[PDB]
Amino acid sequence: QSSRMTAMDNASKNAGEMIDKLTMTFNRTRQAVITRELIEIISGASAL
Amino acid sequence: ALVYGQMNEPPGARARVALTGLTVAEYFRDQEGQDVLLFIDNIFRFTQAGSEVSALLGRIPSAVGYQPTLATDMGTMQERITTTKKGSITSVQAIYVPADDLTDPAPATTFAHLDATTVLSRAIAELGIYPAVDPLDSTSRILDPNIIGEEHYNIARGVQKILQDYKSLQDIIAILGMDELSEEDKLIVSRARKIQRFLSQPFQVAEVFTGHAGKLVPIKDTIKGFKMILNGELDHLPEVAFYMVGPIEEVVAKAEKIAESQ
Amino acid sequence: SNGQITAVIGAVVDVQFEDQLPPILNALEVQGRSPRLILEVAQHLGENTVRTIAMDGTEGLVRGQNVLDTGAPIKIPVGPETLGRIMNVIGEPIDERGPIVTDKFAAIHADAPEFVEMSVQQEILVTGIKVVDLLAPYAKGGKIGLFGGAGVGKTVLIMELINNVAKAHGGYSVFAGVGERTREGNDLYHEMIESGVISLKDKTSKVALVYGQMNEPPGARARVALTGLTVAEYFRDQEGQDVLLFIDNIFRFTQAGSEVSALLGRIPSAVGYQPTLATDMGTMQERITTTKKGSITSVQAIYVAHLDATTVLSRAIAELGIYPAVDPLDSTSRILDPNIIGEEHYNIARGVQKILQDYKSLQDIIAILGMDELSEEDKLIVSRARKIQRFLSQPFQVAEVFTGHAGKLVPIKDTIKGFKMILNGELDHLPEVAFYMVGPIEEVVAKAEKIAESQ
Amino acid sequence: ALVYGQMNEPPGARARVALTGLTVAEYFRDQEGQDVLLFIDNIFRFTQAGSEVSALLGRIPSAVGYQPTLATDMGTMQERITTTKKGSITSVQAIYVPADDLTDPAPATTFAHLDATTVLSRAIAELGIYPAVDPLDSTSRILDPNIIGEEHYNIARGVQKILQDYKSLQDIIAILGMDELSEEDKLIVSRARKIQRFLSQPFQVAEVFTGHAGKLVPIKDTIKGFKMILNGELDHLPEVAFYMVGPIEEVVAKAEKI
Amino acid sequence: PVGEELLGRVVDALGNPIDGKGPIGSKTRQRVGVKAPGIIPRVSVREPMQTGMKAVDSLVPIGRGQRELIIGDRQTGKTAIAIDAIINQKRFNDAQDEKKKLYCVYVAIGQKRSTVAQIVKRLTDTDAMRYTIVVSATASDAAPLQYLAPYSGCAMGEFFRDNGKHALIIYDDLSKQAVAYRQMSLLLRRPPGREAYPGDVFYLHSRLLERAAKMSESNGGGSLTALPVIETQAGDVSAYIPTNVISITDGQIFLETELFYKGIRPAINVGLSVSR
Amino acid sequence: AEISAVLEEKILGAAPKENLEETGRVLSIGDGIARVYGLKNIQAEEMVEFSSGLKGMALNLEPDNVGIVVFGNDKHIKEGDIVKRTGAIVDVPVGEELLGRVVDALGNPIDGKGPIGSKTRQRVGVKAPGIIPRVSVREPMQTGMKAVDSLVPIGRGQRELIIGDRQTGKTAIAIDAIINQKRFNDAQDEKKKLYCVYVAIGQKRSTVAQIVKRLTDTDAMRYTIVVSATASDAAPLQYLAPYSGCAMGEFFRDNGKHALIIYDDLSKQAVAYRQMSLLLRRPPGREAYPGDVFYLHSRLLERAAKMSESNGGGSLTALPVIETQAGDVSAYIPTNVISITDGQIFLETELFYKGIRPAINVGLSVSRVGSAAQTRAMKQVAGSMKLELAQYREVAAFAQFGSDLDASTQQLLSRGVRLTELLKQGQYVPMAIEDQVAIIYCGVRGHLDKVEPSKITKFEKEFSQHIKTSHRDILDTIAKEGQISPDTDAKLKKVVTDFLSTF
Amino acid sequence: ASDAAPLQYLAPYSGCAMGEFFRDNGKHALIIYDDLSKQAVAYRQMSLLLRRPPGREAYPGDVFYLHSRLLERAAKMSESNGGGSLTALPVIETQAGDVSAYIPTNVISITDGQIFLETELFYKGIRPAINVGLSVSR
Ligand SMILES: Nc1ncnc2c1ncn2[C@@H]1O[C@H](COP(=O)(O)OP(=O)(O)OP(=O)(O)O)[C@@H](O)[C@H]1O
Ligand SMILES: Nc1ncnc2c1ncn2[C@@H]1O[C@H](COP(=O)(O)OP(=O)(O)OP(=O)(O)O)[C@@H](O)[C@H]1O
Ligand SMILES: [Mg+2]
Ligand SMILES: [Mg+2]
């Protein structure tokens, strides 16, 4: 029971680090998507 | 003095309200030689109003929808908040972080001019400690042994280290208990509880709502008090004697009253 | 009333008039096109010239070509003569069956019914399909999402809906293939001929077809649903009937509206054809409603947002031999409330859904450990649930020559009574296989008696 | 013969110096009938200098702010570099990927104009493997069993399958560790790590950076060493012995030295 | 038009009667673009505005003069919560206490006209129509009518607020008004922004929702309570219009699709529902 | 039109003698776009000739000038040069004489084998057949690969998309489908023949030379037309090459014959049309594409269908190719072509480097015609095969960490491993339908559950030789009956058990 | 930070000219640009106010040329040119330690090496917080 508790604790810590890296990637991707869609709308409107 | 640019105002008024309050503060600094305080709430609404003003002028927006002049508009507002040869203006600004993203352009532009940080934690308020300032999340750039001194820096680092050890041991205590900890760990967790109890302080402006007389603790009194707690000179006192007490002489006086009432 | 072509840019034609400017949504006919080109006025540009979207191809047009203003929107032929026919956007027959000789023409842009013309009672349109009439009822004037992919009888279900509404209620149906493939349209048309809903030279047709190909211009595909809605509106207003309107689909209608807005250049491509905004879709959605004269019930064919009812077709239900392959648990409806359809109908439907969910849990338990669990109560629950699943199946009138089973029309009271008797256990002694492919519940009793006499 | 137009030059000069080197190679190929080696470093500077002047030519920018004639300009440049019936040209061109991105339009256009591709990855260079060639992103079109031999093709495809299996296992390894893996998964990981170490090779030109003697590995020694690793004949050796060695004999010698 | 002659009447965004019961007899007309009350003429929100739902009155309480958002996906119960709040005031309006009476305004924006007719039938059946004004700008109505209907209903509520009475207003829903204003702004050749919305959609919703206030006792003591409704797509809280409305209001009531499909009705997310 | 010459001749009332009704002068030329003053009697999509001999097409008919897309290098075009309208829209030669020839987008031969003796020419802008003249697709178009002829079957007259990333094998699928038809073109049955058209768009010349070399070495060039619009060609040529290839295939379709067209790839044609539309100042949309880029591909692909027996019975099946950037099928052009075509074949890089070649993603690949595009024996074995593959995918979704699994779960996992190894196929080796039926039947009847998967290809390399040499009477019985009868099933089981005893 | 964006753009070139004086006169000069990321932000503001087309992260497409023409003037001259030299130490401020961004990758490709500073090592008291595994010199 002690070994299983320590193994699940290590798995949760590794999953937390992966969650932090995926959260930074998600924020960077969200900013890039908003910027790209804004530039596309600007280019579509400025062609009139 | 209050300004209060409302949320139903046009974006120009909400953009210039921070300049109006800064102008009142600049008069108090230059023409009186005072150490003025300026409170801005919110500073994200200042950025949002500036973005709306630039979008109403037909300018091309920058990355993540903000104005292209965001850095220089923030710079012109914040560089008037400084210390000069006549006086100084210290600004406490409420900061909202959109979508919990610290890499967003408006918080990242704000953080360049920030000299400190005060984080108010809900969890600390749940522990009854007031003011609910997070001692680990809050940081300052003058924590250096050339501006505040060697003793202040060493004591602040020691308090931070003890509280970090307490936070590391909190998970162990929660999952297993407190009896299996060593004598060193029990001494550390007792000193950490007394340190985080001594961070609470009664406020005069809330003394009607609390019943405790407010205290203005001088910086040397806080330095001496935390040096006494760090060295274990108050290991025999109970933890409740440190709660909602300004100085450390009132800590030992409250401990004496607790012992006599017991 | 006569103008000249000024500019030709793609499917967008700018035409300049001299004396009288046509209003918005009017139709202008090009005088040099042998397959006639109808332009719909989208906006006024000033300077006595208007910008129009084309309903057909634009190759070969020259500047200064004469355009005749009709003084009205696109008037399509309507009536009983359009039943069993295929029309394009502008009402021309494209099924090579001759001209559409009628006396009634109607514009494809009309107003929605008023606030005083709408009934306060949210009546349901009973369609004779037991699973549909019990678990996911069809509301009159509602929005209905019909799901299903390849291999499931989605087409057969659509034709069964057409036949049952034309039989039980006397109201016709209109199919509108908004931007549909030519192969799928040809398969649907031949299946409608084979199953007898579309009948040649007998005048017993039950559905009017409007088609728009994928090679059509974006303006043509954005008004096919308006043509189908206009035919359905004639059947509702001038006949007082409850009319089905099948649209295939709302997604392609929104796509064609977005392409039209992109061609016009005013609204950017980020915003296309909101359900509100009466210019885009609000008029079309509000003209599909129930009034004091009749009702239009919209069924959107979805192949795998505001639906009043939803019937989900699954491959697994067809793999179990249940026709129609409607999933009883994934088919939801906003109408499932005690305050609308009655307390007993909601109670029976909730009991059937609860029994089916418990049956799925019991099947999982049986697959895990075995068929013996919680004495004979679980066995009785399983037996009643399997009798319910068999009774959900029903023969189709339109598929009586491909399956050999004569289809039956089941009124809603018969379905309620039969499922109430199954829930109460009044028919619990009958065999399970006697509940398969039977319309009423007296047919189940007769089937069980014939099984008992034969065995 | 050397032709140089470098990054200090204005964008007009950097967009035409590659054509000057092409002209030298085309004369050496056609008018002399010789075998020519043409080294270009690097192509992306040509296609970027073309984009730097595109806004000043009054052109609408393409996607991600590029020139709208990037594909056609690269096509007309690259089609002159070829092996003809008059003579042969072997061309080696470096390509820069901006911000470590392979879906950028300039490298994505350059991919379809090449026979052999050697993709270098930053993550492999972070692991100390040099040259940092991506094994699962490099194609040649000469990798055919009817061209380079059946054994050579089978060994290369086996190495690529082993490294793909290791890449698929890395997600579970990063969370649950090596304990949850089965015995075949542990063999896959061990052989793949040995393969990744053995792909590294000390270069003669890189000795000043490191100090290892550069090794020239014959292709028969390469296919023999990778066949030995794939057959499990060297599972008893540590993986550090596979690092920065040319032939498989140096692997055995370094393992015996440890 | 404003007044108590509008109670029990179904009107459009212009105030014209559409219920067929005859013309209204209002003697006063109020502008739709009135500036919000200032700091001095208002006091703190302390009078409870009782919704009648246990989860609302306990976990996310709504006071008189408070903007509380009802945000959720399609078919989650936002209209049901608002209608129950309107129906609950019948037990207070019948009593003799003047500080407990609440007059309701329901602004239907961009809805189906049959649904508005069913809502009016439901309020008539429960005797809550006597203190309720229904302002409907349906889908077949023009986008300017959908843009104008929240301001027309706000002016009708502000008449009760400035006369010493208490009013509750529901905007069902503000996302349809933002869509209508986006279409008008795009067709007026105005510079767009994120999701083709103009640069003053935040200013549009803020000047709408800052008119809900608790007036001071020297200013009459009346109040206007706003319950805006936001329809989100797949729970996308971080969209532009939901972000603006969340930042404007004093709190939000989150309705969850997952909780609604579990049969948990009302599907209020307690951990996401805030009341300042 | 307000230029200095026009204002000079209109103030003075010169009335110039140049009749610009049938000719014109160039106002401006740049990047393959020519603005031309004049051409008053020109029509939309009409071919014109410049003074240097170059050709062009009129795409914009503005009230001021005419927009011409230049079919060649724009260095030969100058401002003020004379442009003469041809009076006709673009047409290409069609006939049996194009089989074996490598032509460009305009039908001019580029292989150096002399001219083409074509007696008929067809325009490229022909309207697609309506709902009436076409009939339901039921004739099998046999690609020759087990992973596609069973799971994603293609019928004659069906638009089947081949969509994937770079270097995944879309061209390999198309070339193998072209090569496979040599079995039917060399036979005597006329209705089974399939003439091929390959349209290379934007590729380098070495790649097209390698494709022609591959088709010449395999003798598949004798019934194949290669339409080449390379990377160095003009954007109008790359835009018009699919339409010219479609007209060449429509000649076979309208004459009662069956044609198969590969567009490799439609992404390059969309890029070329995007460049022409952007340089013509048309309003861009999503990802800088025009609003007619959906209409472009829909108009192209709606002409691929099987005609009814009253229209000769000919068919035209199209295989468009789409390149996907990093697997994003949510982009504009992939979404359009997916919504147009009757199904897709999806290729994945991870499946390719895992050993599974061809890397067909079975879950994401649909064929809307389905079992109607299969013969009876292939339908019989593939109906069980797709169910077993679906069960294997369902049980392997939760079998990564599972070791002590159920016996039925282990049997399903083992069967799915055998079927996954069964679907693998080498390059340039198409398979006959009988070999695919026999091998899939052995896979799905449990004959390979006791066989190691790595030997299955060797079993495929040997058992097919066993029935072709010592048990050919069983194959003759299958061919004559057309289905796997239970007696033939028992005989095949006996042959398999005897072979595995020998194995 | 209170100055105009053109002044922030011009200052690295003015300092480079002052260092080029010592470079061309046989002397040796070391120049530090603290920091070039803020100069690129000022140049991005100038280009966005000039309605120039934005590229990666809304930056103009010649920002690589901006840093390359600035940093190519730092070089070692020959003995026939006086034997002078100019040494550059550009400074780049990253967000969350990302060296995969546009401007850091540009300056890495331009310069001969980098000295990476870690926030993690800086929080642990290791000063200077130089990452040895990432900081190289060619
Ligand atoms: N507490 C509840 N108990 C039972 N049924 C409820 C409850 N709340 C809502 N419903 C039912 O759920 C359905 C949808 O709820 P409602 O229409 O109020 O939500 P909505 O968010 O307004 O939907 P829409 O987006 O369509 O306007 C209705 O049939 C309603 O009767
Ligand atoms: N079934 C297969 N078995 C083995 N190798 C294959 C197979 N299919 C393709 N290949 C090889 O994979 C490589 C790339 O395949 P192919 O050129 O057909 O892909 P593509 O989609 O045309 O890529 P590109 O984008 O370069 O055109 C070639 O070396 C080819 O020989
Ligand atoms: Mg609602
Ligand atoms: Mg290819």
DSSP for A11-38?
HHHHHHHHHHHHHHHHHHHHHHHHHHHH
| Exposure letters C217-256 (e unless 16+ CB within 10 A, then b) | bbbbbbbbbbbbbbbbbbbbbeeebbbbbbbbbbbbbbbb
Task: Using alpha carbons only, give the angle F239, F242, F248 rounded to the nearest 5 degrees.
Answer: 140
Asked if residues C13 and C217 have their Cβ atoms less than 8 Å apart, the reply is no
F162: buried, middle or exposed (CB in 10 Å: 19+, 13-18, 0-12)?
buried
Determine the Cα–Cα distance for residues C72 and F457; give it in Å rounded to an integer: 71
Asked if residues D245 and D256 have their Cβ atoms less than 8 Å apart, the reply is no
Determine the Cα–Cα distance for residues B214 and B208; give it in Å rounded to an integer: 10
Count other Cβ atoms within 10 Å, centred on residue B3. 15
Gyration radius of chain D's alpha carbons: 22
Gyration radius of chain C's alpha carbons: 25
Letter for the amino acid at B194? K
Left if phi > 0, otherwise alpha if psi is -120 to 50, otherwise beta: which for F335?
A: alpha
β pairing state of D35-40 and C75-78? unpaired
Determine the Cα–Cα distance for residues F502 and B53; give it in Å rounded to an integer: 86
Crossing angle of helices D150-176 and A2-46, rounded to 10°: 110
> Does E238 contact B at CB distance below 8 Å?
yes
Choose, out of D4, D6, D52, the residue to mutate when testing the contact with G (most G CBs < 10 Å): D52
Question: Which of C214, C191, C195 shows the shortest CA–CA distance to C204?
Answer: C195
Letter for the amino acid at E159? F
For the record, the structure tokens of D235 come out as: 């599972």
Beta bridge mates, F28: F35
Which residues are within 8 A (CB) of C251 and not within 5 positions of it... i.e. 6 or more apart? Answer: C302
Whats the size of chain B, residue-wise? Answer: 262
For the record, the structure tokens of F108 come out as: 């001019």
Count other Cβ atoms within 10 Å, centred on residue C376. 10
Backbone angles phi, psi at B245, to 5 degrees: -135, 130
Give the residue carrying structure tokens 């006569």. Answer: C2
Which residues are within 8 A (CB) of E180 and not within 5 positions of it... i.e. 6 or more apart? Answer: C276, C277, E109, E110, E143, E144, E146, E147
Determine the Cα–Cα distance for residues B130 and B120; give it in Å rounded to an integer: 10
Helix-strand-coil percent breakdown of chain G, rounded to 5? 45, 10, 40
E237: buried, middle or exposed (CB in 10 Å: 19+, 13-18, 0-12)?
middle
Letter for the amino acid at D250? E
Tell which atom from ligand 2 comes closest to the C-alpha of D112.
Answer: 26
* CA closest to E191 among chain A residues: A45
Determine the Cα–Cα distance for residues D225 and F44; give it in Å rounded to an integer: 66
Cα of first residue to Cα of last residue in chain F, in angstroms, is 85
Cα torsion angle, C197, C203, C207, C213, sign:
positive
Question: Which of E2, E92, E96 shows the shortest CA–CA distance to E47?
Answer: E92
F203 lines ligand 2 (CB under 6 A): no
Asked if residues B52 and B106 have their Cβ atoms less than 8 Å apart, the reply is no
> Does B160 contact G at CB distance below 8 Å?
no
Asked if residues C300 and C146 have their Cβ atoms less than 8 Å apart, the reply is yes
Determine the Cα–Cα distance for residues F248 and C13; give it in Å rounded to an integer: 32
Under DSSP, is residue E231 helix (H, G, I), strand (E, B) or coil?
strand
Determine the Cα–Cα distance for residues E131 and C38; give it in Å rounded to an integer: 53
Count other Cβ atoms within 10 Å, centred on residue C413. 10
Q: Which of E191, E200, E210 sits opposite B8 (nearest CB)?
A: E210
Count other Cβ atoms within 10 Å, centred on residue D173. 14
Determine the Cα–Cα distance for residues F342 and F134; give it in Å rounded to an integer: 15
Question: Which of C61, C18, C62, C21 shows the shortest CA–CA distance to C41?
Answer: C21
Determine the Cα–Cα distance for residues D240 and D254; give it in Å rounded to an integer: 9
Asked if residues G95 and D34 have their Cβ atoms less than 8 Å apart, the reply is no
Resolution, angstroms, 1 dp: 2.7
Sheet holding F224-229, edge to edge: F102-103, F224-229, F195-201, F258-264, F315-323, F161-164, F343-347, F366-367
Asked if residues F432 and F481 have their Cβ atoms less than 8 Å apart, the reply is no
Q: What is the DSSP string of E10-77?
A: EE-TT--B-SSS------B---SSPPPP-STTB----SB---S-HHHHHTS--BTT-BEEEEE-TTSS
Beta bridge mates, C8: C13, F61
Cα torsion angle, A12, A15, A17, A19, sign:
negative
Please give the distance, rounded to the nearest whole angstrom, from the Cα atom of residue A43 to the centre of ligand 3: 37
Letter for the amino acid at C12? V
Question: Which of F210, F137, F138, F140 shows the shortest CA–CA distance to F175?
Answer: F210
Asked if residues F443 and F165 have their Cβ atoms less than 8 Å apart, the reply is no
Under DSSP, is residue F451 helix (H, G, I), strand (E, B) or coil?
coil
Gyration radius of chain E's alpha carbons: 18
Cis peptide before C249 (omega within 30 of 0): yes
Under DSSP, is residue F320 helix (H, G, I), strand (E, B) or coil?
strand
F426 lines ligand 2 (CB under 6 A): yes
Cis peptide before B61 (omega within 30 of 0): no
F144 lines ligand 2 (CB under 6 A): no
- H helices of F365-485, in order, are 376-396, 407-423, 433-444, 456-467, 472-481
Give the residue carrying structure tokens 């060649």. Answer: F72
Backbone angles phi, psi at G3, to 5 degrees: -80, 170
β pairing state of E223-231 and E68-72? parallel
Under DSSP, is residue F317 helix (H, G, I), strand (E, B) or coil?
strand
B63/G58 touch (CB, cutoff 8 Å), yes or no: yes
Asked if residues C120 and C247 have their Cβ atoms less than 8 Å apart, the reply is no
C288: buried, middle or exposed (CB in 10 Å: 19+, 13-18, 0-12)?
buried
Query: How far A24 CA sits from the closest chain E CA (Å)?
Result: 17
Backbone angles phi, psi at F377, to 5 degrees: -70, -45
Cis peptide before B171 (omega within 30 of 0): no
Under DSSP, is residue F356 helix (H, G, I), strand (E, B) or coil?
coil
For the record, the structure tokens of E183 come out as: 């279409």
| Type and span of the H or E element at D159 | helix D150-176
Which residues are within 8 A (CB) of C375 and not within 5 positions of it... i.e. 6 or more apart? Answer: none
Up-side HSE of residue D40: CA atoms within 13 Å toward CB? Answer: 30
Question: Which of F206, F304, F313 shows the shortest CA–CA distance to F263?
Answer: F304
Whats the size of chain C, residue-wise? Answer: 455
Helix-strand-coil percent breakdown of chain F, rounded to 5? 40, 20, 40
Whats the size of chain E, residue-wise? Answer: 276
F268 lines ligand 2 (CB under 6 A): no
Asked if residues E149 and E18 have their Cβ atoms less than 8 Å apart, the reply is no
Question: Which of F474, C93, F80, A16 shows the shortest CA–CA distance to D175?
Answer: A16
Give the residue carrying structure tokens 């305009």. Answer: F106
Cα of first residue to Cα of last residue in chain A, in angstroms, is 70
Helix-strand-coil percent breakdown of chain D, rounded to 5? 50, 5, 45
Backbone angles phi, psi at C100, to 5 degrees: -90, 95
For the record, the structure tokens of F15 come out as: 């009335």
Gyration radius of chain G's alpha carbons: 17
Cα of first residue to Cα of last residue in chain B, in angstroms, is 48
For the record, the structure tokens of F235 come out as: 């954007």
Task: Using alpha carbons only, give the angle G127, G129, G135 rounded to the nearest 5 degrees.
Answer: 140
Please give the distance, rounded to the nearest whole angstrom, from the Cα atom of residue F460 to the centre of ligand 2: 22
CA distances from E82 to E66, E105, E273 (A): 14, 10, 16
Determine the Cα–Cα distance for residues C187 and C295; give it in Å rounded to an integer: 29
F168 lines ligand 2 (CB under 6 A): yes
| Sequence-ordered strand ranges (E) for D140-196 | none
Asked if residues C65 and C13 have their Cβ atoms less than 8 Å apart, the reply is no
B238: buried, middle or exposed (CB in 10 Å: 19+, 13-18, 0-12)?
middle
Query: How far A37 CA sits from the closest chain C CA (Å)?
Result: 9
Active site residue F222: no
Asked if residues F497 and F489 have their Cβ atoms less than 8 Å apart, the reply is no
| Type and span of the H or E element at F334 | helix F332-340
Ligand 1 pocket, residues with Cβ under 6 angstroms: C 334, 337; E 72, 74-80, 231, 265-266
Question: Which of F339, F322, F366, F287 shows the shortest CA–CA distance to F165?
Answer: F322
- Three-state SS for chain C is CEEEEEEEECCEEEEEECCCCCCCCEEEEECCCCCCCEEEEEEECCCCEEEEEECCCCCCCCCCCEEEEEEEECEEEECHHHCCCEECCCCCECCCCCCCCCCEEEECCCCCCCCCCECCCCCECCCCCHHHHHCCCCECCCEEEECCCCCCCHHHHHHHHHHHHHHHCCCCEEEEECCCCHHHHHHHHHHHHHCCCCCCCCCCCCEEEEECCCCCCHHHHCCHHHHHHHHHHHHHHCCCCEEEEEECCHHHHHHHHHHHHHHHCCCCCCCCCCCCHHHHHHHHHHCCCEECCCEEEEEEECCCCCCCEEECECHHHHHCCCCCCECCCCCCECCCCCCCCCHHHHHHHHHHHHHHHHHHHHHHHHHHCCCCCCCCHHHHHHHHHHHHHHHHCCCCCCCCCCCCCCCCCCCHHHHHHHHHHHHHCCCCCCCHHHHCCCCCCHHHHHHHHHHHHHC
Question: Which of E239, E139, E136, E250 shows the shortest CA–CA distance to E197?
Answer: E239
E203/B99 touch (CB, cutoff 8 Å), yes or no: no
Asked if residues F121 and F97 have their Cβ atoms less than 8 Å apart, the reply is no
Whats the size of chain A, residue-wise? Answer: 48
Letter for the amino acid at F307? M
Letter for the amino acid at F303? R
Question: Which of F266, F209, F198, F197 shows the shortest CA–CA distance to F238?
Answer: F266
CA distances from A16 to B165, B169, D175 (A): 20, 19, 10
F187: buried, middle or exposed (CB in 10 Å: 19+, 13-18, 0-12)?
exposed
Beta bridge mates, G33: G90
Question: Which of F435, F413, F351 shows the shortest CA–CA distance to F149?
Answer: F435
> Does A39 contact D at CB distance below 8 Å?
no
Q: Which of D7, D48, D99 sits opposite G105 (nearest CB)?
A: D99
